[PDB]
Amino acid sequence: TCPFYKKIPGTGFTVDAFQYGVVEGCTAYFLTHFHSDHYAGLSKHFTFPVYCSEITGNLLKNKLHVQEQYIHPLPLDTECIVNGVKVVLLDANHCPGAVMILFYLPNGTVILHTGDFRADPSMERSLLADQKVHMLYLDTTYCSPEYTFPSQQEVIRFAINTAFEAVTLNPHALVVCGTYSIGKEKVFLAIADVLGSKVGMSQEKYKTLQCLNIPEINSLITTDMCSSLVHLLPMMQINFKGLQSHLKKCGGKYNQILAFRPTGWTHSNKFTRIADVIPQTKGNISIYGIPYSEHSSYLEMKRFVQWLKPQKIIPTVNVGTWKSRSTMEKYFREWKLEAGY
Numbered sequence: 189t190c191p192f193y194k195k196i197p198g199t200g201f202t203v204d205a206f207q208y209g210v211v212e213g214c215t216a217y218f219l220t221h222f223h224s225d226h227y228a229g230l231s232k233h234f235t236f237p238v239y240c241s242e243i244t245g246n247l248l249k250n251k252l253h254v255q256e257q258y259i260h261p262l263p264l265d266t267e268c269i270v271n272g273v274k275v276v277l278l279d280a281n282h283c284p285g286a287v288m289i290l291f292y293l294p295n296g297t298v299i300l301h302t303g304d305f306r307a308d309p310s311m312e313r314s315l316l317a318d319q320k321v322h323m324l325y326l327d328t329t330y331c332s333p334e335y336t337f338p339s340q341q342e343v344i345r346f347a348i349n350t351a352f353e354a355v356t357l358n359p360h361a362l363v364v365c366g367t368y369s370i371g372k373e374k375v376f377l378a379i380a381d382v383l384g385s386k387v388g389m390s391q392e393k394y395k396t397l398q399c400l401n402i403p404e405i406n407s408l409i410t411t412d413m414c415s416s417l418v419h420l421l422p423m424m425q426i427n428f429k430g431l432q433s434h435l436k437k438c439g440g441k442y443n444q445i446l447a448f449r450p451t452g453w454t455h456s457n458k459f460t461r462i463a464d465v466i467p468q469t470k471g472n473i474s475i476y477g478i479p480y481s482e483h484s485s486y487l488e489m490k491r492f493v494q495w496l497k498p499q500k501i502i503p504t505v506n507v508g509t510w511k512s513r514s515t516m517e518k519y520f521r522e523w524k525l526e527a528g529y
């Protein structure tokens with residue numbers, strides 16, 4: 189049965205609630221982004237209206253075969269009316285097509301659902317600036333002070349410099365990047381760009397990336413692995429056995445692999461700067477774990493909430509244990525007391 193934190197009070201709406209069957213008294217189903225924990229349960233047999241971004245709608249049509257008559261894409265940053273309620277979709281700075289949802293209830297309550305997000309000060313100048321928010325449904329994935337990570341920009345700098353150096357030293361090295369869902373495309377695209385290569389991948393993954401509008405994508409990606417020196421593989425194959433096997437498959441075109449595994453967080457961040465990251469090496473295979481996050485760090489989240497000053501916070505992540513929930517509620521109290529709301 190659908191949890192309370194996926195239900196929007198005073199509406200017939202749910203958010204990211206497709207794995208519960210027919211939710212009682214739900215007239216419109218919103219989807220914040222195309223990740224499996226959120227879309228779990230959509231298919232060609234779905235016949236309720238689905239409201240989402242254009243990119244997320246492209247993916248529903250093409251990857252899940254949801255019928256076009258049930259897909260209701262909305263433009264971003266635009267006041268729209270759904271079943272008589274004013275709504276706005278805002279950029280969530282997560283994966284391609286990911287949104288936050290602003291709801292303007294008939295009685296005057298204003299509700300922000302972040303979906304999955306990485307808070308950024310640029311959000312302090314969207315349609316959020318213009319009015320008060322009574323309730324915030326907050327992505328609390330990394331809601332603890334140990335979660336510190338660098339900007340995406342520093343992480344990409346590190347990756348580009350590392351790959352450029354390795355291939356300059358050895359023109360027969362192959363670079364591999366791991367993936368398991370849309371998101372984090374900049375990692376592999378920035379590397380390919382500095383090396384003067386396209387990124388090679390499976391037909392299925394290429395199809396997925398074509399659904400995303402990215403400009404100049406016919407330009408950066410390909411299914412011809414032979415002509416590419418940046419290959420994309422499933423995250424599961426990013427280990428020494430998987431990569432030795434892949435290397436065998438390339439037919440003596442390459443003699444070394446440098447592989448990247450973009451991860452959310454790893455406790456090396458407690459003791460180490462990005463500059464100081466080193467790989468795991470075995471034979472002619474090196475694996476770098478890099479902290480490329482598409483969720484807010486603790487401090488980024490804190491800042492966003494102390495700016496917004498919501499009257500009530502409802503966590504959507506880490507809600508399954510009493511110790512987690514209690515920990516989060518203690519932080520929310522601190523933030524409020526420090527900011528004076």
Ligand code: NI
Pocket residue numbers: 221223282304
């Ligand atoms: Ni997500």
